UniProtKB/Swiss-Prot annotation:
Domain of life: Eukaryota
Miscellaneous: Present with 1620 molecules/cell in log phase SD medium.
Compartments in which it is found: Nucleus
UniProt organism field: Saccharomyces cerevisiae (strain ATCC 204508 / S288c)
Record's comment describing the protein's domains: The 2 chromodomains are involved in the binding to the histone H3 methyllysine at position 4 (H3K4me3). The CHD1 helical C-terminal domain (CHCT) binds DNA and nucleosomes.
Biological role: ATP-dependent chromatin-remodeling factor which functions as substrate recognition component of the transcription regulatory histone acetylation (HAT) complexes SAGA and SLIK. It recognizes H3K4me. SAGA is involved in RNA polymerase II-dependent transcriptional regulation of approximately 10% of yeast genes. At the promoters, SAGA is required for recruitment of the basal transcription machinery.
Name of the protein in question: Chromo domain-containing protein 1
Portion of the full sequence shown: 221 to 269 of 1468
Subunit structure: Component of the 1.8 MDa SAGA complex, which consists of at least of TRA1, CHD1, SPT7, TAF5, ADA3, SGF73, SPT20/ADA5, SPT8, TAF12, TAF6, HFI1/ADA1, UBP8, GCN5, ADA2, SPT3, SGF29, TAF10, TAF9, SGF11 and SUS1. TAF5, TAF6, TAF9, TAF19, TAF12 and ADA1 seem to be present in 2 copies. SAGA is built of 5 distinct domains with specialized functions. Domain I (containing TRA1) probably represents the activator interaction surface.
Name of encoding gene: CHD1
Family of the protein in this entry: Belongs to the SNF2/RAD54 helicase family.
Organism ancestry: Eukaryota, Fungi, Dikarya, Ascomycota, Saccharomycotina
Consequence of gene disruption: Decreased sensitivity to the cytotoxic effects of 6-azauracil.
Amino acid sequence: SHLHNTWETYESIGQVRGLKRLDNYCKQFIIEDQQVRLDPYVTAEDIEI
DNA sequence: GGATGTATATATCTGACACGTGCCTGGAGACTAGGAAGTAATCCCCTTGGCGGTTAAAACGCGGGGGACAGCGCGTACGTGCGTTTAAGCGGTTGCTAGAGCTGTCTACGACCAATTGAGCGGCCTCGGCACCGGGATTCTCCAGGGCGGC
């Protein structure tokens, strides 16, 4: 019901359904997050949008 | 004592039957010409059952090795499942144009018919080339004379 959302960890989950949803989330969100944070070719407009 | 399950009755929806109308296409009746059925003659091909001789193909047997098939391992590539994206499917706008259908007019083009004649089919004579026969030129095998040796 979107109210029992819990702050979990990889070792706190074990093996449940939809683990690869979290894998895609963590993986590619952290890849472009660290990519745009470590790129020197980043303008102010892109980071603010 | 209250509400629920179930039966019969009434209004509405929907496919099907019959009525109506046009129209145009099929049917009835009559006439005519020619397509095809029938006839006779001639000639060549096919049928059935044989014979004779050649000969190359078919059949049979046998050895052997090449290839088909089975089994096993392996690794890769395709199936399967899930999450995400994306584009198909539907409904919609807005004008213009292509095309089917219908009507109308007309003109060039093709059917049709008669006379003609020239291109297609058959045979005949001739030439180009290949082949058969007679005559001249060139080269190969052979018989005889001269010289030498032996008793």
